[PDB]
Amino acid sequence: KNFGLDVKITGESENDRDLGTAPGGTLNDIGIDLRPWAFGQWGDWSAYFMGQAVAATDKSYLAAREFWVDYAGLTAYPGEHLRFGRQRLREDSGQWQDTNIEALNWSFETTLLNAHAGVAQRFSEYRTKDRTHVFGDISTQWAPHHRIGVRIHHADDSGHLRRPGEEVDNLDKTYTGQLTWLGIEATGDAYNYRSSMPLNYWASATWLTGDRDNLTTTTVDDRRIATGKQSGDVNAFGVDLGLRWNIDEQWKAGVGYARGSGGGKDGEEQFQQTGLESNRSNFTGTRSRVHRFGEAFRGELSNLQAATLFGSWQLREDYDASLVYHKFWRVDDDSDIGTSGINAALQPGEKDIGQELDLVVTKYFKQSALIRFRGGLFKPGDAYGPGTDSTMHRAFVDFIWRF
Template sequence: MQSLLLILAALLPSATPRQDAASLDDLRAGQWITVKGEVVTATGPDERTRFLAEDLELTAPEEFESLLGTVSAAPDRSGSWLLLGQPINLSERTEWTRVEPGTPLVGRRVRIDGRYRGPGKFSARDIRPWGEGRDRLAGRIDEINAVAGGFELEVMRFTVFVPKTVVVELERPLDEIQLIPRRWKPAQLVGLVDEDDLLRERIELAPGLRIGGQLGIEGSDEDEYDLDDQVDQGRSTLEAVARLRLAWRVADDLFARAEGRFTRRWLEDEKDGPSNVSQTRLGETWLYWRNALGGGWDAQAGRQDFDDPREWIYDQNLDGLRLIHTGASTRLELAAATSWGGEASPRNRDALNLFTYFSNLDRDQHLAGWVTHRSFQDGSGDQLTHFGFRALGEWLPDSESWLELSGVAGEEAGHDVLGYAFDVGTTFEFDELPFSLSLGYALGSGDNDSGYRQTGLEDNNARLGTVTSIRYYGEVLEPELSNIAIGTVGSSWWPEERTSVSLIAHSFHQLDPATVLRGTNLDAKPDGYHNELGYEFDFVVGSRRWRDLDIELVAGIFFPGVAFPNGSEAARFARFQLRYRF
């Protein structure tokens, strides 16, 4: 009898209850979730959409991402749709279930399944009407961060806030929930948001009113920038920065932002001795009015960030007016701006700047044409007009490529200016290996008086197979693209998704030998007879493993060529940077 009972016990279902719930601590990047809740009012025109979770379920990965809510018309009145703030793209592959193709759906609740391609593109595969209820989204957790009162999950374009009170439901036991890789690749070259300058206004003071900030510290050391080891001329700098930003949604189509910045800098110079300086100034402070002029024309007025994807044209806070027209597949920006105070040089402070930037709104394959006109009001009579075309993004398989073409015409320092420049390259990414390989070549025509020079607003700072942005023309020499040819080769190792270790090499040659090298921080000058400026190697470690903390370590060395005196010493540079957002 005892043996029979043991056999029956083995055949009967286990008395252990099936696991059907988990805690928020069990959430992991790579899990697939379905979230029900509501979209939270945004406080900025371009920020990530925030979603307040009321219910959350961990499920098996689906073939498509999914959005459920009420369809709204895009603010440009182009006839395109938004669902939960996400632009929806229709194609011949879109299937219509229980509704006729092309049926007007604005104001109706629908469920759309499809491929998430990025913040500006959700390729619809199935559209079907849906009944009343809560909004819903389903997709992969790309990031997870603990915050006050719960967790924030990054899912597609959404920042999903999950309060601590939410119970995580399980479709199946937790150990059977598999992790999946990211299905969409964040654009490394193209994007509306500069992650180096990003603030997250996550502290809510009132509905539509939030505040956030950033604390940063950066230290750098320059040695032998005169290329002469017989003279002590090293420099060490330590800088602490605090930023506080207020974001306010004044009305449905009116947004405001105000920012204050405090900087404290300590400098130790072997030639001039120690010094320190403190500065308090106004950061981005503007009003943004959607459809201010009608016809889909937005207006932005105040101190605003003029920043292009590679910071090859400009990267400056300027005071002015910008008009933006966003169509179904294009974006046009027209702006007039100057600098009132801030960190602008006296020459830039006296300049009137006119900008035009026309792009195709595609983050994967970004095309744009642009024009800048700068008129300097310092009595010099200098005027420069730059124009250009660019193609950035995934133009080759498994790669991020760039092509910059530009020309300049005008007058500067009593000389007629007419020149051209180009910058072309690609970063190859290996699917099976955590490595990338970057190759690039850039040229700015000579000579120094009449050849190409950049706008004077550029920063030449972007990712190059790296997590964080780098000086892609060299961290030590850091020249302007003028009367110079620069060859670049680099390789990066990604030990994890948000950390990279990179080694990058540059070669520098002047087109016309000259004693002037525009933009460089070197104190030494070329001899004006030889072309070969030298070579540089940069070692960069960057990490954004924690969403609110950026870490970057840089070391570079420049070996002078025959354009500098025989026996010149190598110049060395080192920098560390920490940024924390709150």
């Protein structure tokens, strides 16, 4: 299989990203994502290319999603390889990195020890100032399916931010500086959708230090507008804890707790994620990756506390369903929260961000095809005040064909 084609037909429904407090924030659009790919393997050499042709109801583009060359001949370890090019950098939680980026990444994956060491930097986004990311991890499977690892991420950004009044696109920097994340992780089939254990867990504690400049934004008629900048020394903490009960081979239910520290005049104790994260994982124990902090809220571990309750059902490799409840609060009731899904203004003094009920339902067909519903229903809390819509939703219907 030197080539193939993924055809994703998606329908997104977004109402309303600003909770009905600003013009914009709505979507009811369809799109086609055509991802031709080319994989070649000549011994220890392996080259891959994935293209992307997207047309949505406007947003019409072409991109080189992945383009890498890989060398596996440094060591006899079949899990050891050096990947160079625009590659997928993903760790199981999606909380450090889950993105396609030009990187020089070294993997060493053995049953007892896992180790990664890479450098990533965007030179383009290959669609129709910069940041250096330096990272590494070392984990040990101390007991079957039980892991304990330390993870490091450094972001070097000598760049600058959009000035107050200017608009901020998604391709823009929201932060600069020198930031080191040092995390301690322990997992027991944390993201294993087919687990041999009645209990799965994840437990992560991360320390963020450094110098950081970061944007403070607002929304002005569907446009993200820079309102200023926080310039400080960072000393922040992030935590994610979860327990998943595998009631049986189909039924799962679990609890989660995460906290991304918040606060400080210039965000001294405000935790943040690397900016390479997707926050998508199989934390509900299904094949379907669910947004860890709601499909609607799209929380980013930054001045955020999240309590999660989830129920899931996986039928063989045919069906999966995940019902996810989250309650969101800020740590500091005068700081902004990390969210990629809600841009509505927050009323100072109010900790209660909201509540969310997510449903992810997928039907798989070997017919190489899947029909997925990923939807978040967010109930705005007191932090967003009165006048807001009683609820917000983001729902997607994906129809994927893999050839």
